[PDB]
Amino acid sequence: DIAGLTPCKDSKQFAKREKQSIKKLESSLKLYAPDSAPALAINATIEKTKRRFDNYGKQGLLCGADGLPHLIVSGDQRHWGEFITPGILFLYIAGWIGWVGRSYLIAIRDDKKPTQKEIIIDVPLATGLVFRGFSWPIAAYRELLNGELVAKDV
Amino acid sequence: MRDLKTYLSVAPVASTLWFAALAGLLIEINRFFPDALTFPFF
Amino acid sequence: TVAEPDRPLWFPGSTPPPWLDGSLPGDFGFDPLGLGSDPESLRWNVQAELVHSRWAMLGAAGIFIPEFLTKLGILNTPSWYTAGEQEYFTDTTTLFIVELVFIGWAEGRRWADILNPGCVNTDPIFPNNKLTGTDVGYPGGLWFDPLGWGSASPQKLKELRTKEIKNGRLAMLAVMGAWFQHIYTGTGPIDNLFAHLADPGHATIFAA
Amino acid sequence: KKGEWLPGLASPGYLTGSLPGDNGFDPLGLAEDPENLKWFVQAELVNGRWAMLGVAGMLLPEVFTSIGIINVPKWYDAGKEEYFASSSTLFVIEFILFHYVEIRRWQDIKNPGSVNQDPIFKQYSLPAGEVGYPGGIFNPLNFAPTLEAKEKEIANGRLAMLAFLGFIIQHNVTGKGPFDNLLQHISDPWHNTIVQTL
Ligand code: CLA
Ligand code: CLA
Ligand code: CLA
Ligand SMILES: CC(/C=C/C=C(C)/C=C/[C@@]12O[C@]1(C)C[C@@H](O)CC2(C)C)=C\C=C\C=C(C)\C=C\C=C(C)\C=C\[C@@]12O[C@]1(C)C[C@@H](O)CC2(C)C
Ligand SMILES: CC(/C=C/C=C(C)/C=C/[C@@]12O[C@]1(C)C[C@@H](O)CC2(C)C)=C\C=C\C=C(C)\C=C\C=C(C)\C=C\[C@@]12O[C@]1(C)C[C@@H](O)CC2(C)C
Ligand SMILES: CC1=C[C@H](O)CC(C)(C)[C@H]1/C=C/C(C)=C/C=C/C(C)=C/C=C/C=C(C)/C=C/C=C(C)/C=C/C1=C(C)C[C@H](O)CC1(C)C
């Protein structure tokens, strides 16, 4: 397949890794009471490990010669879940954060003692401002088009 | 009360409460959807 | 405000805080931590105590009478504590979410007036209905004052509001006590009352 | 009394009820700028008209087919049915036709009245209306573009937009069209909601 990698569900090294992982935990479960707190905790993580391997298999990840799920970021549409849709989500959240911060800075820039509102947050103003980040992309686009995102005069 | 509200909004305390809330949120999210290497919904 | 200078205090002999001049219904000068030294915060907390006491009076009724009336064999209400999961015609989520929108709109109306007194009084469909009350927390209206029992000159009404708030403080403590009693023991409140009255010297919290 | 989305909250300063459908609803401060507002009123109108047409064509055929008059596919399937032409052919046709019409509309948004006249026949222009509601030939029955009439269009358009949101989310989590959803709910309501769906 892409870059010579093979679908983990059909790979052999990916399975071997899963069985080996599951094997060692089972050993930790032994030498204790069969239904003890520690034993119950070990069981829980065994089931968790089995779920993680099956989830990896289901999502169609690519496995190399070591059986480790490699991530493709070239833009192939069979793999947007690996980098590009999480990337769009990140860009959204980071723009939210930055836009809210910038909005706040602009709003408090007009007092006489603006540093007072920086070492001691005006939380009412901040809570009024936080939710504009939800629409930050449209606001920023229209601010760029308006020409008011970038300060002229500098 | 007013002054307690002020002090509770000083930068270090505001930021520790913010980051504790953020940590709680991320911890719970990964407690419900653990071992996530991708976005598998759409 | 009638600044009762010599009202009976919770701690006799000690001066009440300055922001508590007896203006509020049932003011006994109790604010050691000074949680209400701000006029806006004072107002907000007056609203909070009132709504808490009303909810808690409704809850104290709905806990203590059904089990005092099913202890005696009148009907068969289950234990108020585990009364949450005994299934009904639907699931808890459908009823909770349906009720949340229902309860939510009324709460929003209260917020609209708590933060802006007398700006939501009238009805959105038939604008001729006009909830009566002129004080925040005391909305009146045909809906909340059909009997008009306390629309008289501000004398009896002031002693009527104190009555409400005192019953309400008692109810808040009552409801919390039933929850604490139900967590510590494993019985019902009427059961605890009957036991402590059967053997007062020995059947108390110092029984574990 | 310009309408209030939240009875206890005052309305923003940039909104002054001049525009039809103004209920003081802009919590996120999206139109604090006049030019932003002027662009957004056009955006809302065109989105709402498209949504009206869209959920009309999405829902009305469904009840028409489910009461046994026509036999149309589901909207989430009708694209797969093959028609007299390839799908890509239809797509590029629509692309070229839409590109010319949208460009025209854009040129009038940017400079009102600059594209009123027919570019082929130099007679047959448009009467000087106002941006967003282009009268003339786009108004054959010649109804009165009254303010209350404009408000009705804005009110309906917003309802259609919410209806479309509902249609797509409903189909994504349920697995079927809108009318099947409604009849299957009102069949037994207390056990057919989102709670049971999720
Ligand atoms: C370093 C070289 C390079 C670069 C730059 C790219 C770039 C790209 N490749 Mg490619 N690729 C490469 C090398 C490269 N590739 C190589 C060497 C191979 C062979 C292994 C491939 C094989 C390959 C395949 C097989 C495919 C791609 C695809 C793609 C595209 C996927 C992303 C997309 O569709 O657009 C962007 C996606 C979006 C959803 C757009 C949303 C982004 C928004 C608009 C920006 C967000 C900003 C913010 C949140 C909001 C705006 C704010 C602002 C207004 C202020 C993309 C443009 C895919 C493709 O063809 O694309 C369709 C695909 O099929 N590539
Ligand atoms: C309003 C918050 C804010 C915003 C919008 C930006 C925006 C930007 N920063 Mg910056 N930065 C910030 C805060 C912010 N920064 C703080 C607090 C620091 C001190 C650590 C820095 C240190 C910094 C450096 C050293 C550099 C930038 C750079 C940049 C530019 C490139 C993006 C980047 O790499 O950032 C990087 C982001 C960081 C290094 C850390 C960000 C800190 C947090 C995430 C933001 C704080 C938000 C605020 C506390 C929330 C208050 C909201 C209110 C409601 C209370 C970009 C325009 C780079 C640049 O010059 O571009 C060419 C660059 O080299 N920033
Ligand atoms: C609202 C008033 C009220 C009343 C009338 C009662 C009555 C009773 N409680 Mg109870 N309780 C209350 C509140 C109340 N409680 C509150 C708020 C809590 C949470 C701390 C508790 C927690 C509690 C526990 C854990 C237990 C009881 C128990 C009991 C029974 C025996 C008393 C005892 O031994 O424990 C002492 C109870 C307390 C020290 C809490 C009382 C403190 C508040 C402030 C009430 C003060 C009374 C008030 C000032 C005067 C009442 C006015 C009027 C009705 C006379 C008894 C019938 C015991 C029982 O089950 O009997 C076997 C028991 O196990 N209560
Ligand atoms: C509201 C409430 C309870 C509501 C419960 C309801 C509605 C339950 C309804 C039910 O449906 C359930 C769910 C189950 C159903 O089967 C039955 C019922 C029962 C019908 C309790 C509040 C209970 C609230 C309580 C007890 C609060 C106590 C606060 C105190 C003591 C503070 C005092 C001070 O703050 C001052 C005033 C000044 C400061 O300076 C100093 C200090 C000391 C801090
Ligand atoms: C255009 C549209 C849909 C168009 C659909 C079409 C053409 C369907 C076409 C077809 O069906 C046919 C006919 C036949 C089928 O066989 C095939 C398809 C192809 C299926 C929906 C828009 C849908 C648009 C939607 C849902 C918009 C939602 C906007 C919201 C909620 C914004 C609210 C706020 O913005 C305010 C108002 C104020 C801000 O301050 C705060 C917030 C909260 C942000
Ligand atoms: C703790 C404990 C323990 C032990 O063991 C046991 C016991 C004994 C049980 C306990 C105790 C308890 C208690 C104390 C309780 C109390 C309560 C209360 C106070 C209530 C009130 C309660 C009160 C109440 C309800 C009241 C109510 C009122 C009302 C409805 C009114 C109404 C109305 C109005 C508005 C208006 C109009 O015009 C008139 C009318 C229509 C008429």
Could you characterize what this model shows?
The structure is cut from a larger assembly and holds chains A (154 residues), B (42 residues), C (208 residues) and D (198 residues). By secondary structure, chain B is mainly α. Chain B has one domain (1-42): Single alpha-helices involved in coiled-coils or other helix-helix interfaces (Up-down Bundle). Chain B is 67% helix and 0% strand. By secondary structure, chain C is an all-alpha fold. Chain C is 48% helix and 0% strand. Chain C has helices at residues 39-71, 92-114, 141-144, 156-184, 189-198. Chain C starts with 38 loop residues before the first helix and ends in a 10-residue tail after the last helix. With 198 residues, chain D is mainly α. Chain D is 49% helix and 0% strand. Chain D contains 5 helices and no strands. In chain D, helix 1 packs across helix 3. The longest helix of chain D has 33 residues, at 34-66. The radius of gyration of chain D is 21 Å and the shape is globular. The two termini of chain D are 41 Å apart. Bound molecules: chlorophyll A (3 copies), the ligand CC(/C=C/C=C(C)/C=C/[C@@]12O[C@]1(C)C[C@@H](O)CC2(C)C)=C\C=C\C=C(C)\C=C\C=C(C)\C=C\[C@@]12O[C@]1(C)C[C@@H](O)CC2(C)C (2 copies) and the ligand CC1=C[C@H](O)CC(C)(C)[C@H]1/C=C/C(C)=C/C=C/C(C)=C/C=C/C=C(C)/C=C/C=C(C)/C=C/C1=C(C)C[C@H](O)CC1(C)C. Ligand LUT is lined by residues 57, 60-61, 64, 144-149, 167, 170-171, 174, 177, 189, 192-193 of chain C. One chlorophyll A (CLA) binds next to helix 3 and helix 5 of chain A. Chain C: Chlorophyll a 2 binds at residue 10. Chain C: Chlorophyll b 1 binds at residues 10, 54. Chain C: Chlorophyll a 9 binds at residue 107.
How many β-strand stretches of chain A?
Answer: 3
Kindly report the spatial arrangement of strands forming the biggest sheet of chain A. 1-2-3
Oligomer: part of a larger assembly
End-to-end separation of chain D in angstroms reads 41 Å
Choose one word for the global shape of chain D: globular
List each distinct ligand once. chlorophyll A, ligand XAT, ligand LUT
Q: How would the global form of chain A be characterised? A: elongated
Radius of gyration of chain A from the CA trace?
Answer: 26 Å
Element-by-element helix/strand order of chain D: HHHHH
The end-to-end distance of chain A, rounded to whole angstroms, is 52 Å
Q: What is the architecture of chain D at the second tier of CATH? A: Orthogonal Bundle
- Estimate percent helicity of chain D: 40-55%
Binding site for chlorophyll a 27 (chain C): 163
Binding site for chlorophyll a 26 (chain C): 163, 167
Binding site for chlorophyll a 16 (chain C): 107, 110
Binding site for chlorophyll a 30 (chain C): 181, 205
